[PDB]
Amino acid sequence: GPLGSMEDFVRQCFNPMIVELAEKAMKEYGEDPKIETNKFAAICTHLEVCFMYSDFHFIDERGESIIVESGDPNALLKHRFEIIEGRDRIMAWTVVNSICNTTGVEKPKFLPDLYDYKENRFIEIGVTRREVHIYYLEKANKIKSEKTHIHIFSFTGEEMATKADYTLDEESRARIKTRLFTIRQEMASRSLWDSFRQSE
Numbered sequence: 001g002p003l004g005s006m007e008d009f010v011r012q013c014f015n016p017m018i019v020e021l022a023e024k025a026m027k028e029y030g031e032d033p034k035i036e037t038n039k040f041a042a043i044c045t046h047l048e049v050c051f052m053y054s055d056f057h058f059i060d061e062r063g064e065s066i067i068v069e070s071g072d073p074n075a076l077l078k079h080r081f082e083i084i085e086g087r088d089r090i091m092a093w094t095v096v097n098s099i100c101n102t103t104g105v106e107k108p109k110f111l112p113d114l115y116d117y118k119e120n121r122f123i124e125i126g127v128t129r130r131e132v133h134i135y136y137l138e139k140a141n142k143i144k145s146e147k148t149h150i151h152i153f154s155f156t157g158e159e160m161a162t163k164a165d166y167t168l169d170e171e172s173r174a175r176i177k178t179r180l181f182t183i184r185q186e187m188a189s190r191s192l193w194d195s196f197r198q199s200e
């Protein structure tokens with residue numbers, strides 16, 4: 001088949017909000033989404049996973065954890081997760097500081113991806129083109145001491161998470177894996193996959 005551009009793929013297969021947040025992040029770190037395209041695509045994927053991870057997850061009127069698949073449910077419900085990823089450094093740390101002061105949880109040394117109000121812990125999400133058991137150790141060895149929960153997804157369906165605690169129901173994580181599988185397959189059809197995979 002003909003080789004497509006990764007730029008084209010990213011803008012077509014991710015929602016404009018994801019793309020825009022990704023572009024801003026790269027710029028913030030001084031990179032151009034039109035040159036570092038595999039990095040661009042990786043950042044978009046990781047962002048979407050972060051969003052899908054928090055999607056449809058609230059804490060109910062009684063203070064337990066529920067699932068609502070519409071936007072029409074009750075405005076008294078609080079989102080179970082805070083989303084840290086996607087914010088610029090200043091705002092990201094502002095949110096982390098607010099969380100840390102309210103709940104009294106310890107301040108992480110690096111920006112995490114999410115905060116879980118039910119479990120009362122920060123979460124580091126990862127998405128790897130390599131073996132999850134390996135990527136996990138890389139992430140695990142950076143955070144040093146740990147209250148931060150780590151959850152790794154791959155494009156082939158494997159997961160690994162701290163202490164075998166996977167946080168979410170099977171159905172939610174199946175959604176994420178399906179999306180990753182769909183991303184991988186579509187890249188393959190544009191002959192973008194093999195290059196993307198080797199670039200990590």
Ligand SMILES: Oc1cc(-c2ccc(-c3nnn[nH]3)cc2)c(-c2ccc(F)cc2)nc1O
Pocket residue numbers: 025026029038039040042043046085112113125126127199200
């Ligand atoms: O787990 C995370 C990973 C990334 C990240 C790091 C490296 C790449 C990459 N380099 N080369 N090819 N891909 C992609 C994603 C990030 C992250 C998000 C936005 C950025 F601007 C930079 C890193 N956050 C995270 O939380």
Ligand SMILES: [Mg+2]
Pocket residue numbers: 025085086111
């Ligand atoms: Mg970041």
Ligand SMILES: [Mn+2]
Pocket residue numbers: 085111112113
């Ligand atoms: Mn992050």
Ligand SMILES: [Mn+2]
Pocket residue numbers: 046113124125126
């Ligand atoms: Mn992450």
